[PDB]
Amino acid sequence: MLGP
Amino acid sequence: RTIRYVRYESELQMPDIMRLITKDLSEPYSIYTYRYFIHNWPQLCFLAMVGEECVGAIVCKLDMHKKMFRRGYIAMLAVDSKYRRNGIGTNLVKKAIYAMVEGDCDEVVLETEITNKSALKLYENLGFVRDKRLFRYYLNGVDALRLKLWLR
Amino acid sequence: SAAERARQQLEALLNKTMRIRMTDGRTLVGCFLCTDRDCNVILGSAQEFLKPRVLGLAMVPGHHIVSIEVQ
Amino acid sequence: VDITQDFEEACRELKLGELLHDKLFGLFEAMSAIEMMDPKMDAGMRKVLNFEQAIKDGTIKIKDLTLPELIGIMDTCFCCLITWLEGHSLAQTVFTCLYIHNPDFIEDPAMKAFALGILKICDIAREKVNKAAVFEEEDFQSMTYGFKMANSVTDLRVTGMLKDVEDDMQRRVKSTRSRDPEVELEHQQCLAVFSRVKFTRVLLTVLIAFTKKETSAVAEAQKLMVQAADLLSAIHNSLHHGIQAQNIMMGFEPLVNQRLLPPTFPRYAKIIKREEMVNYFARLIDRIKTVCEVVNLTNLHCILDFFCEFSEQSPCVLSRSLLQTTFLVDNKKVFGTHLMQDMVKDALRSFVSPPVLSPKCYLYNNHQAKDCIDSFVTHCVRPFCSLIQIHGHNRARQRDKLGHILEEFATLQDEAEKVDAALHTMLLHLACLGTWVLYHNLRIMIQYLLSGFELELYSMHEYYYIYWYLSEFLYAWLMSTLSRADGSQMAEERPLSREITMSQAYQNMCAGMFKTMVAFDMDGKVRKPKFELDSEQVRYEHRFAPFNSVMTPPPVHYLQFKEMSDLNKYSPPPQSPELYVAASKHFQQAKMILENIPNPDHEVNRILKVAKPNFVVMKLLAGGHKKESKVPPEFDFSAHKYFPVVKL
Numbered sequence: 087m088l089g090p
Numbered sequence: 091r092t093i094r095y096v097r098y099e100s101e102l103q104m105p106d107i108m109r110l111i112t113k114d115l116s117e118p119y120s121i122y123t124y125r126y127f128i129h130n131w132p133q134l135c136f137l138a139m140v141g142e143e144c145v146g147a148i149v150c151k152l153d154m155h156k157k158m159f160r161r162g163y164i165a166m167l168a169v170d171s172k173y174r175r176n177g178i179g180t181n182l183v184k185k186a187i188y189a190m191v192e193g194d195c196d197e198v199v200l201e202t203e204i205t206n207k208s209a210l211k212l213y214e215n216l217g218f219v220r221d222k223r224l225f226r227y228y229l230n231g232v233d234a235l236r237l238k239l240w241l242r
Numbered sequence: 243s244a245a246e247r248a249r250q251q252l253e254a255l256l257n258k259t260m261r262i263r264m265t266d267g268r269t270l271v272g273c274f275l276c277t278d279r280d281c282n283v284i285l286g287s288a289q290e291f292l293k294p295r296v297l298g299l300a301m302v303p304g305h306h307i308v309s310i311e312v313q
Numbered sequence: 314v315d316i317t318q319d320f321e322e323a324c325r326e327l328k329l330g331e332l333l334h335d336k337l338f339g340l341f342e343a344m345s346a347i348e349m350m351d352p353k354m355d356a357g358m359r360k361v362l363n364f365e366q367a368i369k370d371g372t373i374k375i376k377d378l379t380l381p382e383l384i385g386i387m388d389t390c391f392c393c394l395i396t397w398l399e400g401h402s403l404a405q406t407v408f409t410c411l412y413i414h415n416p417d418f419i420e421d422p423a424m425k426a427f428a429l430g431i432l433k434i435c436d437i438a439r440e441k442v443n444k445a446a447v448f449e450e451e452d453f454q455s456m457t458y459g460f461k462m463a464n465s466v467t468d469l470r471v472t473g474m475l476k477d478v479e480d481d482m483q484r485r486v487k488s489t490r491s492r493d494p495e496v497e498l499e500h501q502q503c504l505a506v507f508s509r510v511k512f513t514r515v516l517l518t519v520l521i522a523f524t525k526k527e528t529s530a531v532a533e534a535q536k537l538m539v540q541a542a543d544l545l546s547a548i549h550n551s552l553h554h555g556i557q558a559q560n561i562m563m564g565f566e567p568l569v570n571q572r573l574l575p576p577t578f579p580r581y582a583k584i585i586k587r588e589e590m591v592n593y594f595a596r597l598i599d600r601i602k603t604v605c606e607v608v609n610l611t612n613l614h615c616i617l618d619f620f621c622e623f624s625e626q627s628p629c630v631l632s633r634s635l636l637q638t639t640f641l642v643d644n645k646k647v648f649g650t651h652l653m654q655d656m657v658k659d660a661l662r663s664f665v666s667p668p669v670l671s672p673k674c675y676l677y678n679n680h681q682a683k684d685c686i687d688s689f690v691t692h693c694v695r696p697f698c699s700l701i702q703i704h705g706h707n708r709a710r711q712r713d714k715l716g717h718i719l720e721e722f723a724t725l726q727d728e729a730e731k732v733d734a735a736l737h738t739m740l741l742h743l744a745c746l747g748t749w750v751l752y753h754n755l756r757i758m759i760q761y762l763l764s765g766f767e768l769e770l771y772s773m774h775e776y777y778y779i780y781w782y783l784s785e786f787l788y789a790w791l792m793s794t795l796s797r798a799d800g801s802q803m804a805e806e807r808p809l810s811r812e813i814t815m816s817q818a819y820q821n822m823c824a825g826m827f828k829t830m831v832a833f834d835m836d837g838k839v840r841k842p843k844f845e846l847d848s849e850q851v852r853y854e855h856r857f858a859p860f861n862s863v864m865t866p867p868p869v870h871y872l873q874f875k876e877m878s879d880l881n882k883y884s885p886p887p888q889s890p891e892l893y894v895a896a897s898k899h900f901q902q903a904k905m906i907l908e909n910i911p912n913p914d915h916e917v918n919r920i921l922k923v924a925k926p927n928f929v930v931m932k933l934l935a936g937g938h939k940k941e942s943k944v945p946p947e948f949d950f951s952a953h954k955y956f957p958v959v960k961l
């Protein structure tokens with residue numbers, strides 16, 4: 087889950 | 091039920107990916123993020139399709155970071171609820187890993203919520219190693235874990 | 243040739259004001275940067291007045307805009 | 314001019330996957346584009362009203378405030394302040410109180426005084442947090458969004474105003490000091506309001522004392538912190554009197570700050586409930602009480618041990634900053650009294666006692682030797698400040714900084730070795746400063762390795778070689794360094810007895826865990842990567858990559874690791890029974906070594922709480938219990954952070  | 095893994099071919103498959111990711115993933119992704127990942131690296135995106143529908147989606151990226159090692163990245167992974175525990179996601183990650191290693195990748199990284207035990211078990215079985223702990227890294231609030239798979 | 247003319251006109255439409263005025267108002271102005279076949283428009287240094295906000299890069303989607311205007 | 318009709322038709326004739334960027338914008342500036350349609354992306358989406366437009370409207374109360382309304386407002390302001398201290402944004406959490414936007418317009422003395430006190434507390438906390446700079450990207454949001462926080466009135470005047478408000482309520486409390494139920498409720502409400510005002514004053518005074526430049530005022534806050542216990546007891550007992558919320562209480566506008574929200578994705582902080590407000594303040598007060606004792610330590614090693622023990626508690630962001638600031642009130646002066654170079658010299662003299670620092674040696678009055686040792690101490694002053702700053706961070710981000718500090722510590726080790734060699738040549742005292750630096754390096758490496766267990770970064774199959782590095786190599790080197798340090802102290806003549814005992818216990822427990830894991834693998838009870846291809850050599854090399862920077866002790870590669878940890882070296886090779894017996898013996902040795910240690914502190918009690926149950930399991934499993942089972946064992950880390958309980 088690409089996270090900031 | 092025969093499960094077929096087909097690589098990404100054209101933008102007509104984008105609505106299939108967006109539906110699977112949104113209904114499964116928690117963080118919010120705009121359509122331009124999917125467009126970036128698909129267009130820049132179309133060779134690393136694979137789908138799991140049965141009949142005339144879509145039940146799986148893996149979206150990945152590969153780019154050199156800090157000019158030290160070519161690092162691969164698994165950006166999105168989703169399997170439909172009715173079709174989980176059939177090994178679809180494991181095979182998707184295996185195909186992505188094989189594509190990355192054919193692309194001369196040195197390491198593969200990804201993040202996931204610590205509460206999501208299924209993905210942690212899958213990655214530990216596949217051989218991933220927990221590398222860093224990130225507190226409140228997501229929007230929901232769940233602490234994120236950075237898993238790595240060192241190839242060289 | 244019609245497709246080429248339309249593409250040239252759209253390319254010339256860049257670097258302008260291109261006020262958005264989405265379906266909820268918000269009177270976005272910004273500057274036009276890119277578009278797609280879904281008619282969604284991405285902006286830059288865009289302000290948002292309810293009914294200034296200095297958003298970074300708005301991505302007003304196709305099925306949320308009413309009528310755009312360029313000064 | 315409107316061009317929507319001419320724009321939609323043109324856009325509908327694209328290539329189905331073609332963009333319109335000209336030459337300098339591809340997909341990356343297009344990343345992080347705020348899609349102004351989704352609820353989770355666009356930050357901005359009865360009637361929104363600020364304080365100025367609410368005073369005239371009448372929906373706000375700025376005069377003749379009822380006691381329950383005051384109690385509710387104060388309690389919810391406390392909840393918002395705690396939520397901000399927990400890491401949430403200032404504007405969306407604490408400034409939802411319309412009263413603290415401008416306390417000048419407030420006319421009620423109690424509400425105005427409390428608002429000024431809250432603003433002063435926020436200002437002091439923000440200043441202390443920013444000065445220490447021990448907060449990461451997301452552990453604190455010190456941005457004030459351009460607001461002004463009680464910069465006009467002096468802090469002493471605010472404290473005096475709070476004292477006057479408390480004095481004007483003590484008379485009311487005593488006036489009703491006594492069967493009428495209404496007067497009883499009024500007296501209870503007045504007592505609650507007085508308790509809240511007094512606790513606000515106490516906390517503000519504690520922070521003010523921590524903001525003073527004199528270390529004397531720090532110790533004076535202990536009495537007020539003690540008073541805070543009774544104040545919080547009263548504040549928690551009288552909690553069902555204030556006006557409850559309607560989430561939205563009468564006085565607060567949750568969405569009054571919409572033009573000041575950041576343009577990025579929103580996080581939507583959730584203010585805590587009133588029930589948990591009292592507990593958090595009690596924990597914070599206890600933490601500040603623990604912090605206030607750091608001004609009594611006189612040597613560097615005790616200071617470092619105190620910092621480690623405090624950080625092991627997982628404290629809040631504010632308390633760590635307070636500890637850092639009270640340790641280093643200036644950029645170069647510790648506690649504001651002693652220069653750090655003198656502290657490092659005292660630590661060296663107390664730990665190893667080199668001849669150069671000894672007054673009875675000819676090297677104390679020498680010009681060249683004094684300059685050389687001063688240069689070494691000056692070079693050493695920086696890495697220790699960096700190490701303490703690293704200890705000031707949170708648990709997750711300590712590991713990376715500890716791994717990175719090893720480069721500077723290895724450079725310092727090389728410089729110390731060169732200095733000691735030159736001094737010994739001049740004198741004619743060998744490896745004294747080298748021994749000190751080696752001890753600090755080994756302590757850093759040990760804590761770095763254990764932080765992996767503390768943060769659950771180690772998999773089931775990774776335990777067996779992580780514990781080996783701790784047991785056979787690192788702690789073995791540490792024991793030699795401590796023995797050399799203790800020996801040199803007596804040779805030039807026990808403060809290090811407790812550290813030696815603790816190190817022995819830790820080494821014994823680590824060896825027992827390593828043997829248990831090796832036996833578990835031999836039996837077949839440990840799950841390994843079943844597929845793909847991830848060589849254990851690469852995993853080992855990347856796990857122990859940060860240790861490559863240091864030179865003493867030399868790093869151990871995978872090829873050398875197998876030879877040292879191979880069980881085939883013993884003839885005949887030991888079966889799992891033997892490894893179980895060895896683990897039981899190690900656990901028994903650790904238990905005996907701890908039980909023989911006088912005055913067991915809190916750290917010993919927890920370690921005893923894991924050695925005892927695991928020893929019984931090891932002996933029981935040594936008899937062949939569940940030998941045929943292939944299920945993996947369950948490790949519980951609740952008892953101790955670094956050493957789990959082997960549960961079958």
Ligand SMILES: *C(=O)CSCCNC(=O)CCNC(=O)[C@H](O)C(C)(C)COP(=O)(O)OP(=O)(O)OC[C@H]1O[C@@H](n2cnc3c(N)ncnc32)[C@H](O)[C@@H]1OP(=O)(O)O
Pocket residue numbers: 087088114115164165166167168169170173174175176177178179180181200201202203206208209211212215
């Ligand atoms: C940022 O993208 C990445 S986070 C990945 C996305 N998480 C998410 O919630 C969306 C997708 N999630 C899933 O549905 C599921 O987690 C996936 C993505 C792993 C898909 O599941 P699969 O069914 O494809 O997983 P398998 O391919 O079956 O293999 C999983 C391994 O882990 C064990 N496992 C899986 N789910 C489990 C549950 N619910 N409980 C226990 N164990 C679970 C599987 O059994 C398998 O190990 P095996 O022993 O079965 O081989």
